[PDB]
Amino acid sequence: EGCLEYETQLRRQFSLQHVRVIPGLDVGGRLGIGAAHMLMSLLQPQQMLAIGFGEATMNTLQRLSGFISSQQIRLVTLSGGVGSYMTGIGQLNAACSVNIIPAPLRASSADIARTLKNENCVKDVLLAAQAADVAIVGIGAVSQQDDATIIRSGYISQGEQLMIGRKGAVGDILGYFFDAKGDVVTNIKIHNELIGLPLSALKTIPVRVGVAGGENKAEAIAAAMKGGYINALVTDQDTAAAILRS
Amino acid sequence: FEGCLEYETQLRRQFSLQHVRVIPGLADVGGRLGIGAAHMLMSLLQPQQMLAIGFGEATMNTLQRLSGFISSQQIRLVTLSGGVGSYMTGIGQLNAACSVNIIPAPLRASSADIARTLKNENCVKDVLLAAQAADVAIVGIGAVSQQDDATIIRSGYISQGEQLMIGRKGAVGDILGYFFDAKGDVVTNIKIHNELIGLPLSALKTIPVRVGVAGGENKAEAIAAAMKGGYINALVTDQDTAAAILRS
Numbered sequence A: 001e002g003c004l005e006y007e008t009q010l011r012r013q014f015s016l017q018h019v020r021v022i023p024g025l026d027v028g029g030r031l032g033i034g035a036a037h038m039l040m041s042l043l044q045p046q047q048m049l050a051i052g053f054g055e056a057t058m059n060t061l062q063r064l065s066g067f068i069s070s071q072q073i074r075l076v077t078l079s080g081g082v083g084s085y086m087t088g089i090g091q092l093n094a095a096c097s098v099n100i101i102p103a104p105l106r107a108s109s110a111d112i113a114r115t116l117k118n119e120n121c122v123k124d125v126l127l128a129a130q131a132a133d134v135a136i137v138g139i140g141a142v143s144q145q146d147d148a149t150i151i152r153s154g155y156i157s158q159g160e161q162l163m164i165g166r167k168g169a170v171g172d173i174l175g176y177f178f179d180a181k182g183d184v185v186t187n188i189k190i191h192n193e194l195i196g197l198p199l200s201a202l203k204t205i206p207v208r209v210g211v212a213g214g215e216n217k218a219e220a221i222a223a224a225m226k227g228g229y230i231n232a233l234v235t236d237q238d239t240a241a242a243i244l245r246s
Numbered sequence B: 001f002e003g004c005l006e007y008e009t010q011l012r013r014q015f016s017l018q019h020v021r022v023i024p025g026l027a028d029v030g031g032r033l034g035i036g037a038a039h040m041l042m043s044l045l046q047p048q049q050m051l052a053i054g055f056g057e058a059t060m061n062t063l064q065r066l067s068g069f070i071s072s073q074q075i076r077l078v079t080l081s082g083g084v085g086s087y088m089t090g091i092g093q094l095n096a097a098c099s100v101n102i103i104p105a106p107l108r109a110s111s112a113d114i115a116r117t118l119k120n121e122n123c124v125k126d127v128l129l130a131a132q133a134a135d136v137a138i139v140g141i142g143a144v145s146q147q148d149d150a151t152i153i154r155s156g157y158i159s160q161g162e163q164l165m166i167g168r169k170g171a172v173g174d175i176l177g178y179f180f181d182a183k184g185d186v187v188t189n190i191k192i193h194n195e196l197i198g199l200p201l202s203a204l205k206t207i208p209v210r211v212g213v214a215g216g217e218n219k220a221e222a223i224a225a226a227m228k229g230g231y232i233n234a235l236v237t238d239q240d241t242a243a244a245i246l247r248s
């Protein structure tokens, strides 16, 4: 009931292409339903879907697995890491096309990241990802602190997250952190250590869906939309309220 | 006389194997090899044990047939090589509660310095160690004599030129991109070896039970060599191939 109005206002405040706002209070399971449903009406047969990692995207992929088979959707990873995509990929049948960047999410140095990005088998998948028809990503917030997936998964340290925060970052997509206005934070070393597509290349993809909730993400989700990284959103009612007031 | 039971006995004694299965020649073989290798693995793996897997058609067919058993017995899988995508037809068949540990790297780097770098990345080194600690391994065996039909060529991991020179330098086959000569010794002057990300054959031998699954007469010399080098200590093959291996 209050969902339609919040959709409308989100669509107009952030110039979005599509929005779904789910009734408030479990939330992550219900976000995956909402995002799977949006993706079912967006994707045409044999189209390509680029995927990010995290709980909300993995949930979504589970609810979409039957659509993916019967419409022959091709999947491609937006980042390295492999293992982080397996909970969502394991829920598909084995005739599904899945193209996986064969590298770590983050290299121990920027030189090594650049080396890896130039290996043929990595470079091939980076291009495929950038060419996708639709993308589905999660959004992390600095305000989650130890509960953020990117920290639980060991990809950045606590000291890094404190400094990322100090430097004015509010949230991230695929390890790429941006400030409250949506601008990528430029003096953060991790950015040049990530193997996957940068957020500037992600914007090649014409429909880019963020799925994310919890009031603690509101600032990050707003900023993601202000930066243009996502042009469609799936979120929950309380978060929507919080974004609109942010 | 002869038959499969005799061929098993002879192979077992001749190569000092721990386990052997020879399937009849007569309905198509790579599928029946997979069934036979899954049945052997089912009798060797205890619950919660760890199975190291290599890539290729025979291993991926085996894993497909083992998927129900992997699930119910909570078998943990780990990749023996990089490549990620080379393993998807196999691991794609499992359910999502399955424990699957994948080397997050290419199979082969563009240079040896780059391979050495990737082997020292934390997320790669962790999985290399997990693989070496496995209870059982399952691998395919490739033969130089397959030429353009070898999976290692068909998948683009080596060039025709490379395959030619590897043959010139005395290799007969490979396991996981590591090529050995007819006595079973790894061929030392081949640059693909230092470019591979995964475990070398010497570290594969840590795994106590090492099952090769491979058939076709053109692989006979390579399979014999693989047993002579000790890379596999158990074999699943077909009748014709067993006969050829025995006369090698």
Ligand SMILES: O=P(O)(O)OC[C@H]1O[C@H](O)[C@H](O)[C@@H]1O
Pocket: A052, A053, A054, A055, A056, A057, A137, A138, A139, A140, A141, A148, A149, A150, A172, A173, A174, A175, A212
């Ligand atoms: O909170 P989740 O849904 O688990 O996932 C969010 C992560 O996925 C996003 O692209 C960012 O990397 C975040 O770091």
Ligand SMILES: O=P(O)(O)OC[C@H]1O[C@H](O)[C@H](O)[C@@H]1O
Pocket: B054, B055, B056, B057, B058, B059, B139, B140, B141, B142, B143, B150, B151, B152, B174, B175, B176, B177
């Ligand atoms: O002939 P297949 O069963 O497809 O696979 C053999 C390949 O997989 C083996 O370990 C070697 O890499 C071979 O090159």
